[model samples]
Target: RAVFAAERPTLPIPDLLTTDARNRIQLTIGAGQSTFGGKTATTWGYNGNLLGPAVKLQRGKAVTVDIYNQLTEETTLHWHGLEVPGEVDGGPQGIIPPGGKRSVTLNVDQPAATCWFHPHQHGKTGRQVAMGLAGLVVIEDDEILKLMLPKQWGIDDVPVIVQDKKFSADGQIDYQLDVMTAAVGWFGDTLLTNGAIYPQHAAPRGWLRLRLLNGCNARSLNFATSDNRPLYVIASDGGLLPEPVKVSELPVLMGERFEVLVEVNDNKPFDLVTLPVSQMGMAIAPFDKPHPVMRIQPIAISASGALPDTLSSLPALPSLEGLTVRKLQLSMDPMLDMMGMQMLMEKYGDQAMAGDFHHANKINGQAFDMNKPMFAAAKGQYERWVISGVGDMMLHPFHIHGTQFRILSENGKPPAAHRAGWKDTVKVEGNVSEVLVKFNHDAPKEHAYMAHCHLLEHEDTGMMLGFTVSAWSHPQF
Candidate 1:
């Protein structure tokens, strides 16, 4: 149900840990008891009881991460939005041995931004993530060094990892089933703010940065303040926007992240609420009605008072007037041929099709083949991609790996002002979406880059494809 924020327990701010010269961070995946609604439920986490750790990283440094699988099965610790090598990027095959350990040495070569580490184990991704296996990673850059925004971690600035779950009568997470489940991905009935039920964050009277990660499985949410206060946005998937945009609300899609600045000048309480979408509007939504996500309890104080008018110089855009375009279509041809639908039905027929259900969603009429590269590109080059949704009944959020892109158009219209910056993901609702992308890393078959739907179930169902970039020439069109 849509519970009021004031009626539930206060939210929890995750603890932040900094990087060492070695950057030896160990992530242990196991089960733990999570207390909510005055009851205990068994769930999974990285290194803590419920949620995982928040890692603070810096630009231009080498780091190492070790992952230990304490769970009965296997998992991959993917570095979402981080521009590391494809092997360490944690794509589908970036698997660690059964109950074994795996390590990676990576250079923090990307701009300052809010990223995350999550599980990406092919078809079983949605379930493990729903159970708990995600964390936050904040990176600092030369540009961030010049900003006057609040830098405190657990105080003025905080981590907001948002998710949803459904619990049973005994406080254990309960599973629901339906024939339409796979069509819209699995969603829960309960919302969790920083792993707490209808939580609240205490904000001192000043400017604070709230880094948000849409860590939900299938729900696409529209959130705003109960009082309709402005949310001054500063960053997106890649980093700081050209300039801050002041808005009272925004839409959050699956697997997306954003950083916004909000000024608190008085002791007035502000409830951050998420509005609902009716089942007819989106049968895939987690909840059915409007509800507060967190309570921003304001306090009077005196520190740095406001944000700089200018955040950072927006990255310059190169010419793409006549750039050759590559094509990636998002569609599922149900009647294209029974060649694969029969097998698909058999694989996803039982078990609600939530687990181990790849090949149900197709890209360019083909399922995901680890050995195949949808196309190929040369390193140190740039190209435009025409991504479209055809014959799909629902909206699709498209995401790319290895590098970010600039939107050219959506449905033949210019991108909205808030979306005219560097981004790794773009939303294509009932038509065409185009983006000019850069290829900076090699992602061969063994360590390929991925392009897929932000919806986990749609992804596991096969709304995904892979491509590569190398110095050598390869097949492309």
Candidate 2:
């Protein structure tokens, strides 16, 4: 159900909270009532009634986050794009029981970028996130200080968390996952930006920095303005690009982030919308239409500087010579053997048979096993990971935890202009994508790193793998 900008509600800017003298912040996960399209639904959020606050983090400063699990079930708070040790990374292993409290200290050593925090529980991830358990983590550095960009939160620098949800008739979130949705991914009919349906953001006439996060579970969004204005993309999942790449529309898959600059010179209210693209593979509702994400209502004038020409001095791409190459095939193999398929069927039989295809979207011919390790990587060494999806029928957004990696190639060709930067997530469309990845911190077996499809339902079903980063490395291929 796409709505015009005039009929939308005001966009809710997530509250910005910084760290204290001790470099600490608190987040409490709880349930709350939120309104969507004039219907109030019971949802989950972090420290608020709807969504969580934008926790501001600074580079080089070690920050401690105190999280309280006030929900009825266990959950984790994973620093989506943060490069830290596995113990504090909040993977599925790190669990905070209901009504329990946990604290983690993170060393903010990465560059300025727009990261996020959300639940990473194994099977319940899709359901919990669908209930609205995610928030933004803004990182700032000296480069951001010299850029003279729109640094203020809400007014000039805005947080645009784009999500889609399907609600019940009685204003409850409808999160029933059948076999089809489990095989491909779940999609919603209603689009919500920052927890509001067809929201409106009032901004002063100047340069607007929109930190956009594709917080949806499975939907792929192609973002553009109503008037087809250029989106000056300055940063990606990892951090700032060498320079901004101007594009008419930016395609953001699930679990990806992009920071763009849009200049508003008039008082006209144009919508920031998602256009339907053929890359979606399926003609799903909402994705099948161009829907307004948020209405940008330019107000009075404000003093703003020009967009920065040069953004960052990112390092060169890693060399392919002598690097360890691990080929991971996603959803390409039906099963390892009859025994393996039987095991998977025994585990997820009911869910697997709900669709035409099996829900066991395996990685490397094997489904996800909590006690299994896909591979092992040596700490402080870079390796080449070839994520192949040649036999897959759908587009899968692959995400790696722990550290951001540089995209080396896509389908044997150079990456697109918008993807020529550091990334924690990459798109695989019936082909191969390569990346040079390294882990500076250690991830033990008890708390390992994950590489999975960004589509939550696919991840919950099978399309996931776990590996540990330690002092020892596997044999180079």
Candidate 3:
């Protein structure tokens, strides 16, 4: 167990990088070091000591991003939750070798949302993301800006990239993933907020907005305040909700995002903590307990803002009568999984019990194969996807690329009030979940779009599939 001093470290706000005169920005992924709770570890970041900068994008403006891979290994920068063309979407198909660089331009065409960017290399996504190579993509629109909410970046408005990590005795990262741990994905004992352990933020007095991102590899977080205050949730993975949903606790699965507001009345120290829930799958040690993520100290500065009654005017859910229905089973074939485990055991011998071996996961009894495109559809075609989590003890957070979808029902019932907004990721909790999806952009077969478990370990293991959206439709199907 690790002990810390009484004074907590200040939460570091990432630098905000906006487009230049030519609408261009550059991000470099390289090596660095960070000290967590007095333990220093080698890490990776984008243009900083640890983690990356927040790239701000205006709606309807096109921005070109130049990515440079300076690490010793190859990596690709994927814009998570962005609706761009497949070629520039940064899926596993696009690779940037060491010392190599590439440029891609994206036309911001979606509503305001809190998205992110990270490496999407097939087998290395978990490791890369856990190594501190991720950042936020803040999209803004006139509608959201006009609302009476906290708008100051890093001040009243904050970005919280919460992650869990394990550290070695020598203050290094311990990424040993055994068979049992790999089965459910990696779980760390230590909690990190913006790469800082035992961190605190000096929030302004009045209404405070938090842009929360669950950056954990596999663990799901149920965010709650120590005082049990209500969180006014305003947005989801894709964009702002139609109205704020007040809740005592909010569940944000892996690779999910939620924007919420809380009132800070006094100057006393208040903490935002994580509450344990059954949806986390297994009852692991540290994750099974309540852990304080960050402490909020409200200063005397008088920040003026009122929570809006209506955050965004989202349209009604479309009819599912004539639209195509796609069934997706998020399950791992027992035999195929055993074969993968056997291969790992044979390769590593006894070390397989302790070493990290990427196990092959599946979407529909088939592991991810680059040569296979699982589904094909025409651009702008709406469909209802019935995604089910098969087998017991399976709670998968399914995510789709190039589009934002609305949840129709969960386990045949209407979605919860917080999930009534547009989302790109949904937690299929060992049951049936349905969502309405429509892709507005085209993703050709050469560099197709992806649908997979947002749990980085499962995604890297093979719980992912690619699909293409053609410009034309075929009447045969």
Candidate 4:
């Protein structure tokens, strides 16, 4: 039974906060009481009792954020796509001590796109984000202002935060991490759109633009519609595409974002659903299966201003002629314990790769070591990195820091139009996925950027690795 068609989830839309004269926005991360499914429960949020508020930003502005963490445990607030310096990238080193506060400043200099913020602590990422601790960031530019599309919030234009969650018997948010789940990550039977369970929205009977975020821990959101109408994909992780690409389905891995325009027919109720991702390296993945994410009930028909032929003029992908190619593999041997990893830590002492060990998950059989630089690159150089999954045992959603890349291929096949845009993370479950990556800014040795599996548990345990650019490089990753 599709309950969303009858009883719609009445979740509140996140309030919008503006950057002030000093270019500052204060965000409070804390715990509060919220009633979900008629049961009062304690949930974490950016400003309120449930999800969080949206922080609207402008390009070419100097912005500073005061992050206050009132949770009982420590958490590192990470800006998922903002290209800030390593010191303020919200990596593991930028920890927000429990009941403590930290201030970070950055030049809002990236392209205008939909990004997000959440906890990136080593071990608590999944727990904190699952419970409730994530929000949205929309960076706007003058070019985007020229476009004609739905901009209203909670009406036609909306922020769709797709999250899967499980609840306790009493209807409270339940986060029970078992051994099996720890290995494969957790999955929720219930779907929450913008924190609203089984949510339904009434479109203003026009072409509406929806900014989507796949905020789940392990699941991949395969976005589609029940009526099978094509989605006009406009923007991606970094920003707008050169033009609109029509596709019936969009394959969205975790930690990725996409902005799409959908025209709901007159008074014809349509549903935004998740179709099956037919192929994944692993034999089983619930997130790859079908699930209804959101339902749209159009008030009437307004076909005017459907969408322009051209959406944006994207920059050239650049030539790969001069770029050197590097091959990297994704394999898991054993989830290492802290003790054995420490011993190897002792052996590699005083060395660059000394800290590298098989702690939990490993890259090329080497686990993450804090003091290690898995690889190195030049600031203004380009490199084609081929990332591959070892086998069918499991798949990894690979994410990189500092700059975005263009998907060159997947298993020697072309990527879907929605994924063809500039992306920072891609799902590599089968043979291989390639991207033409570039290093723009300088990440120092002490404060370096990281790339790893977006699955928080794999990252927190040891499946992650860090790297440097410009000055010099670290041991081969």
Candidate 5:
């Protein structure tokens, strides 16, 4: 059977709270389980549940949250898309040991968007996040609040946590990985939307806004509508798109987020879904059953306001016209060939492994080294980065922490339609895609940010690197 013979229960998701302004909120990370087939098992969560609270922060306001760990293991919460001081960015240095607590304070400075937080402990991020220790952070601004979008919480405006999982016979999640599986990463046969399996949603016949987060460890979703209609993508990782990009397909990779505004026809029923597309034409590893990620049922539609002709206008991204830096070519390194072979053996055993092994994934002839930094730059200095994939591994979603950048060129040509806006992550095809990035935030030279492949297993196994944006200041900004 293609699907593994496992039946693990869903982990217990936590009921989160929104702290009032100027209030201190306590977050607990612990363990719990669900009963499936009449047996109980152990799992992890934040605040006694799978995911933590959805922190609602106002722009320009300083907030402090106390995180307590009651679990027997160690973990730390990394604010995925937040621009906070490095010490509290929840890097490995800020791990909260069992029975310990840490307070993180930061001022929300970005535009209104959806962000998430989860454990970033080295070698354990996949396992912890897979077990359910992640949560959302929504930053609000006055402009967003006034938009004619879906405004109801937990109803029209839903926080969709998309993930996949594998289950053991007792219904408990099984995260054990052999060397091969660990290298390639885990992929689940079951897809979940907002923690519900094969769930259905009823939407009004108006314009509906859905904030979708690809919280899965390794799966990449090729999303589309059930009726082959175009879904308007309003926002990406950094924030809202300059204008809506109407498309029938959106490939959301791991650790990425998308905000889609769909116009639900009042007279017709439409289902929002992640339909599976064939991987035969693609240049990457192939997995069976590349089908629809999720199914959405829109039963009735209500009268709604007109869809906005234009969303928010984003500021012009800074230029790289005068900057000059040596462009670096990255590709798969051959030295890691043994590691790849080991990974395949662990994942599919002797029977399922296939094809010729090639060294096509690498950065400067080296795999990821957590202790080493990729590059360093002075704060506020702009530089040009040229990234490319090699051989048959055509495109890779490249992500950087701390700041957003503008794509300068792709394949010796200008960027395409969706890449024009400010982006913190961009997809690099087989050939070089040059981007102009600037380190404008203040951070320590020793304390760095990360830039790596958005492929979760690739990232977990060291296809990632760190870089420091130092202004030489140690004081908390």
Candidate 6:
């Protein structure tokens, strides 16, 4: 892999909350100068910089954000990991034309956690986010803040947006994908941590909370400490885990998030690398390559406060006994009949081959329909979702909006010690995994939350669906 300079462009964090019904957010996607080479240009960020602002919201609140498409082409913002109405979820159906704008409202009723928002226009999400159009969404709650955990930003607490980018000879981003890569998914050579090429931070000789987000388009990071130190995993996509699990490495797939609490030993450096692990069992392509994602260079360690053994008390998950269980199979098979083929051709292009139009990465042998509801469950009902892969395929980091669920089983067995906690997203290998989900928020019959693959490309193509959580039982529309 080519070694690019560890330099990143700076972006201003604007106060994203606005009083008006529509909150304005700007995005720009095009070529610009790079730090490595003078006048070196590549596709870069939104609002005249890299990455968008950090949006903060409260539970049980309604928020309206008006996204402005300052870019030259059409784009849409999908509120990743947020449980909102299908229309406002900002899927492929909500595209913002060039110089146009689209307004999205999110009714926050879920628990407090860290989420993200990015462009979700089909066939372009990877390119759009790769060029910089992703931002952090921090849901707040008084109960969560009261805990004795790291809370200060730019200090003990930090949001680490980890991603990989491919740079051209001029030190600009190049996202041209060949056929094989497009099928498997694209991977980049350069790794970026929180928009910085190789970011470094000073740490105290105590516990530090790191909000890790795997924003890579397709790369799955197997994070580990160079010294083989035990990293404490306190939370997953949903929120705080029941207890911290000590592990040497954590597998973070694309679009997934994790909250890790690490204790810094006396002023020593710790290198966080995504090394190749054969345990994943993914087939290596003929032209596959590997490299490190980022490095944590410790300059000096200052004195930090006492490290607490227990951070917060997580609520006990509801029992799955006597609960309605659902089996949903997600895949990507081709559209067979004439009508299906016509729709596929229209959605893709005339040059689109049969495989290009459809694959088996759909749910229950059916691609997700934006206008239709995939599943409907009554509010306050506990349900188990059994998700499995059909064939030899890469693992899918499955995500659900609205409520947190506990891992019940993996491959028809109980969860591992590290997975016995709340999770909004889970990595399901080629085998089956069961998640116990409870719907607590009220979703209108017409509006519902989404459950889909975190892979933006696969989601855009067809591997997504919407669901409604109401007080009454209803049939899938």
- Steric collisions counted per model: 3, 0, 0, 2, 22, 11
The TM-scores of all predictions, comma-separated, are 0.90, 0.92, 0.93, 0.88, 0.83, 0.80
Residue-level lDDT tens digits of model 3 in 200-283: 999988999999999988888999999998999999989899889999999888989999999899888789989885643323
Backbone clashes counted, model 1: 3
Q: What's the ranking of the predictions by lDDT, best on top? A: 3, 2, 1, 4, 6, 5
| Deviation from native of the Cα of residue 133 in model 2, angstroms | 0.5
Q: Model-by-model lDDT, in order?
A: 0.75, 0.83, 0.84, 0.74, 0.64, 0.65
Any runs in candidate 3 off by more than 4 Å, and if so which?
A: 279-282, 335-359, 475-477
| Clashing residue pairs, backbone N/CA/C < 3 A, model 1 | 11-199, 11-200, 361-461
| Per-residue accuracy of model 1 over 290-357 as CA lDDT, tens digit each | 66688788866655734768777666778887766788878864542232334435634542222223
Model 4, range 1-477, lDDT digits (tens) per residue? Answer: 543356776535788877888889998889997666567777899988767888888888878999998888888777878777777888777788878989888777777888888887766677888888999888889887777656776676688898877688887777744333444555566677887766777777778788888888776778888888888888899888878888888877788899889987667777788865542211133334456777787875353444767767756678888787877776654432233334433533433121122144666666677688877777767789888875634557888887778888865678877677778887777578898887667777676788888866566556677887765545573
Candidate 1: residue 472 Cα off by (Å): 3.6
- For model 5, residues 311-408, the per-residue Cα lDDT tens digits are 67876656557775735555554434456556555655653443212223456665556567766666777778877665434235677677666778
Candidate that would win on lDDT: 3
lDDT, candidate 2, 2-121, per-residue tens: 244346677898888788877889999999888876778899999887668998888998888999999999999999999999899898889999999999998888889999999998
Q: lDDT tens digits, residues 138-228, model 6?
A: 8877756766677666566667788877677766777743333333455555667766655566666677777788898776777776777
Off by over 4 Å in 6: 1-39, 44-48, 60-63, 105-107, 168-172, 176-179, 278-291, 297-306, 332-355, 358-360, 411-413, 442-448, 473-477
Lowest-lDDT window of 10 residues in candidate 5? 278-287
Worst 10 residues of 3 by lDDT: 351-360
